[PDB]
Design an enzyme around this catalytic site. Structure first.
Site, mmCIF file in Angstrom:
data_model
loop_
_atom_site.group_PDB
_atom_site.id
_atom_site.type_symbol
_atom_site.label_atom_id
_atom_site.label_comp_id
_atom_site.label_asym_id
_atom_site.label_seq_id
_atom_site.Cartn_x
_atom_site.Cartn_y
_atom_site.Cartn_z
ATOM 1 N N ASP A 172 4.614 0.612 -19.415
ATOM 2 C CA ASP A 172 3.245 1.427 -19.267
ATOM 3 C C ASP A 172 3.773 2.440 -18.361
ATOM 4 O OD1 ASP A 172 0.822 2.509 -19.666
ATOM 5 O OD2 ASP A 172 -0.269 1.114 -18.566
ATOM 6 N N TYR A 217 0.972 -1.280 -0.040
ATOM 7 C CA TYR A 217 -0.015 0.157 -0.212
ATOM 8 C C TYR A 217 0.888 1.273 0.066
ATOM 9 C CZ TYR A 217 -3.374 3.595 1.498
ATOM 10 O OH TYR A 217 -4.143 4.639 1.429
ATOM 11 N N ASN A 245 0.973 5.518 -12.757
ATOM 12 C CA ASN A 245 1.740 4.259 -12.565
ATOM 13 C C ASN A 245 3.146 4.383 -11.630
ATOM 14 O OD1 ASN A 245 -0.112 2.664 -13.476
ATOM 15 N ND2 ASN A 245 0.862 2.548 -15.425
HETATM 16 C C1 LIG Z 1 -1.850 1.242 -10.812
HETATM 17 N N1 LIG Z 1 -1.742 0.500 -9.789
HETATM 18 C C2 LIG Z 1 -1.430 1.180 -8.659
HETATM 19 C C3 LIG Z 1 -1.552 0.089 -7.746
HETATM 20 C C4 LIG Z 1 -1.287 0.170 -6.172
HETATM 21 C C5 LIG Z 1 -0.642 -0.581 -5.415
HETATM 22 N N2 LIG Z 1 -0.635 -0.190 -4.207
HETATM 23 C C6 LIG Z 1 -1.246 1.083 -4.216
HETATM 24 N N3 LIG Z 1 -1.473 1.825 -2.892
HETATM 25 C C7 LIG Z 1 -2.125 2.827 -3.159
HETATM 26 N N4 LIG Z 1 -2.844 3.512 -4.147
HETATM 27 C C8 LIG Z 1 -2.664 2.454 -5.482
HETATM 28 N N5 LIG Z 1 -3.518 2.750 -6.595
HETATM 29 C C9 LIG Z 1 -4.469 4.301 -6.457
HETATM 30 C C10 LIG Z 1 -4.663 4.559 -8.023
HETATM 31 O O1 LIG Z 1 -5.367 3.443 -8.499
HETATM 32 C C11 LIG Z 1 -4.886 2.241 -8.665
HETATM 33 C C12 LIG Z 1 -4.514 1.870 -7.066
HETATM 34 C C13 LIG Z 1 -1.928 1.203 -5.438
HETATM 35 C C14 LIG Z 1 -1.727 -1.176 -8.457
HETATM 36 N N6 LIG Z 1 -1.878 -0.592 -9.728
#
Ligand SMILES: Cn1cc(-c2c[nH]c3ncnc(N4CCOCC4)c23)cn1
Length: 290
Positions: free
Chosen positions: A136, A93, A141
């Site tokens: 990507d 996270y 990302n």
């Molecule tokens: C593109 N992507 C990001 C992750 C991800 C992993 N950890 C996260 N902790 C916090 N936020 C996140 N995101 C926020 C934006 O949407 C998506 C999940 C994540 C996964 N895929």
């Protein structure tokens, strides 16, 4: 089999408290969650395998690539759990949110841009040394921890180079950030990620990539046809040069991630990641309104 795939009697609904949706990733939705044993916060991507066809090969490839990365610059993978038809992918996270989200309150300054790009370059140098291609790279990302640490996420289209497969030709990525050789499906390698980094540098400076107002089908002819984009506006000569270095139509003329870590833009402007908490705090305060 699937790397990190857990025992089927392990019920993820028991092991994790699934909280609010935080976004979308390749193949499914991402939720904030709590690991019930440690009480740590995790990100959980849930994929409905019944709703997928010829996508499972790609889902497995993502998990394989993540499980193989061990870097402070790449989101950690904790394992996968199958609950009925749904696959729960447990990931690190990152509470600061994406660099894309952090642009919402307003522009970044050049120190913030240089710091974020330097950390992305650390991630790319790691991946490229592992013969991996992200494919990507974009601000959505690029994720930040609550402490300002910067990591690469979403390995949904990541490629693996070998001694027998020195180049790839698959059409993958997000149109606006795609390298001309990827769009044309020419033989390509890690240099495609250097081009995407150049577009991400424009996105961090301007808030959007080049051609952002056009339909993605138009950019499929525009990118190979046009001279490369340049950074326009009142930005430093080192920043404009950093962009131009990445955005060359000839892949061999683009520097490596390792070389870009020593670019004058990075060395003159990047500072400690701990300073990025000011950027996260700005986004928290701005959201506390809306
Ligand atoms: C593109 N992507 C990001 C992750 C991800 C992993 N950890 C996260 N902790 C916090 N936020 C996140 N995101 C926020 C934006 O949407 C998506 C999940 C994540 C996964 N895929």
């Amino acid at each position: 089999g699937l790397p990190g795939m857990q025992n089927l009697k392990a019920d993820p609904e028991e092991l994790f408290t699934k909280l609010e949706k935080i976004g979308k990733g390749s193949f499914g939705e991402v939720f904030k969650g709590i690991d019930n044993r440690t009480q740590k916060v995790v990100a959980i991507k849930i994929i409905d395998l019944e709703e997928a066809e010829d996508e499972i090969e790609d889902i497995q490839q993502e998990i394989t690539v993540l499980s193989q990365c061990d870097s402070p610059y790449v989101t950690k993978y904790y394992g996968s759990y199958l609950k009925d038809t749904k696959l729960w992918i447990i990931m690190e996270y990152l509470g600061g949110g994406s660099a894309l989200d952090l642009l919402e309150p307003g522009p970044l300054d050049e120190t913030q841009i240089a710091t974020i790009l330097r950390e992305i370059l650390k991630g790319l140098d790691y991946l490229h040394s592992e013969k991996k291609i992200h494919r990507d790279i974009k601000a959505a990302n690029v994720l930040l921890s609550e402490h300002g640490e910067v990591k690469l996420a979403d390995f949904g289209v990541a490629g693996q180079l070998t001694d027998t497969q020195i180049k790839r030709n698959t059409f993958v990525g997000t149109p606006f950030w795609m390298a001309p050789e990827v769009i044309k499906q020419s033989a390509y390698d890690s240099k495609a990620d250097i081009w995407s980094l150049g577009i991400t540098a424009i996105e961090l400076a301007r808030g959007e990539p080049p051609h952002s107002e056009l339909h993605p089908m138009k950019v499929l002819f525009l990118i190979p046809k046009n001279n490369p984009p340049t950074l326009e506006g009142n930005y430093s000569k080192p920043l404009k040069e950093f962009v131009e270095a990445c955005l060359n139509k000839e892949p061999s003329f683009r520097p490596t991630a390792k070389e870009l870590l020593k670019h004058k833009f990075i060395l003159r402007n990047a500072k400690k990641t701990s300073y990025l908490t000011e950027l996260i705090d700005r986004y928290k305060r701005w959201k506390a309104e809306q």
